[PDB]
Design an enzyme around this catalytic site. Structure first.
Site, PDB file in Angstrom:
ATOM      1  N   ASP A 146       0.854  -1.194   0.067  1.00 21.31           N
ATOM      2  CA  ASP A 146      -0.057  -0.061  -0.060  1.00 21.31           C
ATOM      3  C   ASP A 146       0.923   1.184  -0.005  1.00 21.31           C
ATOM      4  O   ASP A 146       1.709   1.447   0.829  1.00 21.31           O
ATOM      5  CB  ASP A 146      -0.886   0.018   1.262  1.00 21.31           C
ATOM      6  CG  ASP A 146      -2.023   1.026   0.988  1.00 21.31           C
ATOM      7  OD1 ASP A 146      -2.001   2.145   0.849  1.00 21.31           O
ATOM      8  OD2 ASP A 146      -3.233   0.559   1.440  1.00 21.31           O
ATOM      9  N   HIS A 219     -10.074  -0.894  -7.931  1.00 20.13           N
ATOM     10  CA  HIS A 219      -9.501   0.322  -7.000  1.00 20.13           C
ATOM     11  C   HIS A 219      -8.613   1.193  -7.997  1.00 20.13           C
ATOM     12  O   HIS A 219      -8.498   2.501  -8.010  1.00 20.13           O
ATOM     13  CB  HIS A 219      -8.993  -0.034  -5.586  1.00 20.13           C
ATOM     14  CG  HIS A 219      -8.706   0.987  -4.761  1.00 20.13           C
ATOM     15  ND1 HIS A 219      -9.296   2.040  -4.485  1.00 20.13           N
ATOM     16  CD2 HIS A 219      -7.463   1.361  -4.019  1.00 20.13           C
ATOM     17  CE1 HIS A 219      -8.741   2.972  -3.670  1.00 20.13           C
ATOM     18  NE2 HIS A 219      -7.404   2.522  -3.545  1.00 20.13           N
TER      19      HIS A 219
END
Ligand code: HEM
Ligand code: HEM
Ligand code: HEM
Ligand code: HEM
Lengths: 306, 307, 306, 306, 306, 305
Positions: A146, A219
């Protein structure tokens, strides 16, 4: 040449996020805290030269700004806009001040937070406090790396820092915070391959899916935003995992910096409201926002002149 | 345009301070070294990359400068001004060359110091040699965090580097050194609160005292200088602890860098002579300066071109 | 404003050198990869923040350039020039693409290499692959500290990066690679003092020999070049030891970056052909070049705009 | 008596060196064996305390009779070739094993250099592998490798020869197999399928439940209970290795045990199978290209060759 | 079986050696410190768990023993024996108490030394104080790796710790200290090969010279002593470099632990007086001893019951 | 007799997890207990170099009788509440203890996730604490904490069950108490006054001389010589935790001992006091919120289920 706060600083292994509201008549106490914040930062930070990497970024909300300062306002400062999608909602919650504290160790973060809140006792009400921790090789609670595509160097500087578009507040930035709780049971019900199609990247290796295979409701696809210019619109994310095993809380604490809130808000709309191709971001099927606030993080020297 | 020495580089865990005078007829050798000092630094330093952090800052004194170079003098270059206060005295001691050697390890410092002195053998007389070491969480021998309020980034750059005011010496800096010995016996006789009032900061946490709790004769009060501008005058300090347990030597080796000596001297005058509000700096009641020298640290390319 | 590749970054403890040629028809596959190389670097590299220090520098050969692109070429881009000296020879061997992969850990280099070759499979033929490793205190296989006199800061940028002299390729660089094998047996026959006279520096302390003692045919003397205007001509070297014990193979992988190949070639020429006062570089009596290739490392933005 | 570092943990770097003794080489080899520990200290002491240099020397069955006149270890014999229906475990030549480990490759390479420098003209190299740590203790199959290794007292009982053969107490048996993997085939399987092959979760390394764990899984077939009920255990120091260009992705297997019978049973189950499983599924993606058995004497056995 | 002091502990990167004489009438103050010394060690040491590696070994001289304690004496405790050889001389200098303080950081050592002396203030006179530091890859001021052949494990225990031969003081040890200053000028005038023949080991690699090239007057030859049974007599050395560049002091601080002083003394005799084969130890031609003391370092629980 | 990682040193991060076993959750719990060591390895091996992951499992007195038949550890009983004049050592529910330690919080959190994942719907969480190292091994009171812990053989003898209870050799007893501190009050004191409360110097961690040390200092009251003449010792793995917003600044106390009698004697002297001391002065700045006692069996004990 104005000096910004550490909004461009890289991700650290520990973090504390403090969100507070200012009580009645708390303005004075808050003002002279703001003038001492950088001072308090060095007071604790210097103890852990050189590997400490302690920093504090202070943010001020729209409502709070007017109570604290006479004079000009940042051009883009407003309350966080609640988004009530057909399925998923981006809630708005109260928050006047943000303290984003990062370091290579939690003790430094906690010590600084203690000093900050010690000076604020009886003047503020705590809304949110989160202790973030690095999770393996920069992973989130969903098991994915991330922050990969965060801009670096000059690209980051132009994406994050207020410039000539608002000369008086140049060196500042806009922070959006959202506390997300994850449904791990539902997520763990998916196969790795299915999970990859939700995110838009390979789980273990963090390699981006080919344009051939990448779903429009992934996403990565939704949060890829092109301006009328044709240039990539980017934000700088400093997301941290948090949680409590007993209360079955597995969380991502989202924070995004950009020179204008519009950029972040556009991405939020695409995620929550959807596009022509996607009803919404598929990550929200496993993620629930429980907080939402917007803050302006001024240049360091603005705070020091109080 | 001009390349400075590592005068902006941060504090390290190990340091060697070397101060020598130049003997009559030693000029040739000294100049010869000065042009090779940077290459000697790399010879030792490259071995321990990337975590070696070896650097050498070379300083030249006022008297030495005239003996060494014919040509323009740095505008602010003068010998250390001795301060004879009513109680405390800032002595001026000999010193022609300063070598401020830093690394993350003492061996690197020692090796470099050996190579430098090897070249200077019959041309210099050693005046002072201090081996500095990091003490816990950046503490000094008084038990207080030391260096907290040092400028960083662009602020450090403005406060330390000689600029347009003296163009031919752009990239340079001025270093003032003072070796202090502390009376630990008298110090540990004070309570922590009393010690805090002497310094002007909390002991354990390093948090600055409130402006209306901070005495006017505290170290922080007297070293807080505001110029005609209204801006704060800042120096960059690389203080290191040192000492010998057997000889009851517990010391602070003071080194401050600034773009002009006038800044350091102002602070020094306030500590030793006092203000309207304060007789002298309370820190001097437990600290004795036994050396005192001022050096100009030229831009790196100045040393290199000496040839 | 043009962003360079990590051509100025320092030595790391691990490196992978990869040289390939482009098979007939591979051009399209190669172009597609070149545009994703920076993306693959971040994908692998982000996992090991902040101690990873993963970088990749991609270079393109003279013949490869003409197959891949149309329009203007870098001013100095040509195939490696073979140097046929009386005693020693610098050979030219094939290579279309250089991947210079560095990290603090080998796993990072290997993972990136895997991802690159995965996407090039069936489009390229491998020519050379070397896994470099740091040997003690920055020593080469001859037992001498290697890289000491590399330029740093501004001088490095001046010596390495193409500027106004070739404005369409500013931010680019030229990389010369040569794989050297050492005859250790012959080398160990020498005394330390004798080895010192070969190199021109003290073995243990790495201090340079004085100008009176340093021989004219020493490595340091011959690779010390001043230009017509008295300025020093410098290159940046990222040499790495490699070897195999069972094969009695002890090597230096030479890689040198410079703003023009003229600088590197003058050094090669002085080494292999000699000067008025030296028949050749003594180091070549104990070192054999088994590869030789020249590549242009474009500015980063050049690659992403494919 | 004092054993060799056969209980020592996994390091980030390793060199495996397998050689045969040439005729007339016995005396040179015997000299080396007496000095091997002192060579280990000569190199190793330089890098204390984070070097962790160790070298385990093993001797083959045929080699033992050529070298030594006294008694033989009870369990020492040549590696048994296993010719199953589908998969074959080859026996390959090997007289001496050097298992060299450190936290850095340079230390391994330095020791290997010294050892081979003394053995030149006496030995013929068969195999040389330079192993490297891959992420969070993973193998080239992307799974955490070594998890169930015994520790503490259990390791001691599993690995070290005891009173069952008192004249060789403190010794151990080492089985080496070089495996090359078919990564194309393996990456054609879903993560869930890969988990079925191995017998554990890929990312979390958590063992599959006994109800879902296939009988032909790696973990199932290498779980062997003795005639007494308790599990047979070996100590594995497997290292990844490879070459990207040559499509070589490998696991270097090495297992220590107090008797080869344990390791051989385990190997028989893999190659030949049980009543419920035809063979180990890992072997459908793994080919053994070497196979050798060695006895690793107690340290004092080696030095008392004066 | 009693607890020894940290006499078996490895070499650290920092050390303080402290030697004092007990003032007339200072016995009671000394006794009180000796009983609290372990507390002081833990008081300081615990702050830097677990990388601090702080230890203190306390030694008591022969004459001081009689002044401090009544009853039994360690069997081998006597004042240091002055050795007046034909050329070189080992002086005996006063010392009653030895504090051998080690850690990974000088600060920990200095902190402890401060506490010790703070208690001893006015009851002792300091004779010697040395601050030792690691020099590169475990090297001394002569440029040779120093401490290679130190015994480890059970070998170290057997060579260092008093056993059943003097059971009242089991767990104790004997320490010999000598401060040596080197004539670096003269030493740096030899070739590396000459230096190797003085030490008896290769300089860069630390590999021991073969027994047919190693001179009889080399350091390693004269300090290699075989005992009654034909096995080597060994000591544990914790040598640390020290010095002052200005005063041209380049030093080795010699400290050797042994279960009986007789071993260390034999080595000293051979070094200083010489043998039939060797006039004296060639290392003495470049090294002058300026101190010389012998101490008993009792078991930890001896100090506690005081 | 292979013991759990009870002799293991302090780490930078810790997770303390206390649960009660829900009715009819006995089977699920017993099954986890047999797997706990393999779960520890599964997570721990990933950071094999310097992860330092450990998990100590403890079982309460009432929990024991619900889980196992036959032999009970001699000294296993519920935590004895102490109602002193002023301060109160409360007893709170707890059937299972998971003392998880590593050099990194991620390791701790992952193991806890796996443990709790398996226990879902069989247990009720009572307490969860994320502990963290605070500077140079300090507690929230600003004092170095753990200095006088036994080490080596001393530790082994003080902590591990021996011949006195041969069925459970290599076990230990763990006492846990979550303490919350009144920081406002504490930081009102001068350093010198703080030192008299603790019994050691604040910065240097040097113990006060026996002639200046108050009889009601923490160090004085917790220093117990047994009837045999030698000092009684426990091993403490105290960790700071807290939340700045809630004003929660805590010490999670955990102490290991061969017999609970040792720990209980200390508690007794702290809460009830002695002849010369009313109570431990540290308690005027410290409130105990939880109190539980667990037996931590030998490792092999857990495996043979
Ligand atoms: C006796 C030796 C000295 C000791 C032990 C000492 C120690 C300290 C300490 C503990 C502080 C507060 C923490 C910090 O910000 O660094 C401080 C601040 C400072 N000292 Fe000193 N100091 C000494 C001498 C000097 C001298 C000779 C000067 C220059 C004339 C100087 C200039 C300063 C300055 C400028 C500050 C920062 C004040 C502020 O802006 O808050 N010090 N020193
Ligand atoms: C056989 C392989 C080679 C080895 C082992 C080697 C080794 C060394 C060593 C030990 C040094 C001195 C330390 C330093 O790096 O500054 C050096 C310097 C240097 N080498 Fe090489 N070298 C090799 C090939 C080359 C080649 C092919 C070139 C140029 C094409 C080159 C260019 C240089 C330069 C420019 C210097 C710095 C000279 C100075 O200004 O002092 N080297 N090399
Ligand atoms: C083809 C190369 C091999 C690979 C990639 C491999 C990989 C693995 C993996 C991923 C595990 C599970 C995690 C662990 O406990 O380490 C494992 C377990 C194991 N492997 Fe292998 N392995 C290989 C060959 C072998 C061989 C040849 C043997 C012995 C003949 C062996 C014996 C074992 C044993 C005993 C276990 C642990 C079983 C248990 O859970 O009790 N492996 N291996
Ligand atoms: C002048 C200061 C000294 C220096 C610089 C020095 C240096 C060395 C060096 C470089 C070695 C070889 C590497 C090693 O095994 O440590 C060595 C070995 C040794 N030294 Fe010294 N030494 C000194 C004084 C002494 C003294 C006074 C003694 C005895 C009282 C001594 C006893 C030994 C022993 C026993 C060995 C190991 C020899 C072997 O068995 O191979 N050293 N020393």
């Amino acid at each position: 040449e104005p000096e910004p706060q550490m909004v461009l600083s890289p991700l650290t292994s520990a973090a504390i996020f403090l969100v507070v509201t200012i009580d009645s008549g708390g303005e004075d106490t808050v003002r002279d805290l703001l003038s001492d914040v950088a001072s308090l930062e060095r007071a604790v930070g210097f103890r852990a030269q050189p590997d400490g990497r302690l920093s504090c970024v202070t943010g001020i909300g729209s409502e709070a700004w007017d109570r604290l300062f006479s004079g000009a306002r940042p051009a883009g400062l407003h309350p966080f806009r609640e988004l009530d999608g057909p399925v998923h909602r981006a809630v708005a919650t109260p928050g006047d001040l943000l303290f984003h504290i990062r370091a290579s160790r939690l003790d430094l973060c906690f010590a600084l937070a203690t000093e900050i809140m010690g000076r604020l006792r009886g003047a503020v009400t705590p809304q949110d406090e989160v202790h973030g921790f690095k999770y393996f090789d920069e992973r989130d609670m969903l098991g994915f790396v991330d922050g990969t595509e965060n801009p670096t160097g000059a690209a980051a500087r132009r994406a994050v820092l207020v410039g000539a578009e608002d000369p008086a507040f140049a060196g500042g930035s806009y922070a959006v915070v959202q506390k997300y709780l994850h449904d791990i049971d539902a997520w763990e019900g998916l196969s790795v391959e299915a999970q990859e199609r939700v995110i838009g990247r390979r789980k273990m290796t963090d390699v981006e899916l080919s344009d051939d295979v990448k779903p429009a409701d992934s996403h990565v696809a939704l949060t890829s935003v092109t301006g009328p210019d044709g240039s990539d619109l980017e934000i700088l994310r400093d997301n941290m995992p948090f949680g409590s095993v007993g209360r079955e809380e597995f969380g991502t604490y989202f924070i995004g910096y950009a020179r204008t809130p519009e950029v972040t808000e556009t991405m939020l709309e695409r995620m929550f409201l959807g596009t022509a191709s996607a009803p919404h971001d598929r990550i929200l099927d496993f993620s629930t926002a429980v907080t939402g606030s917007l803050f302006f993080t001024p240049a360091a020297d603005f705070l020091e002149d109080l």
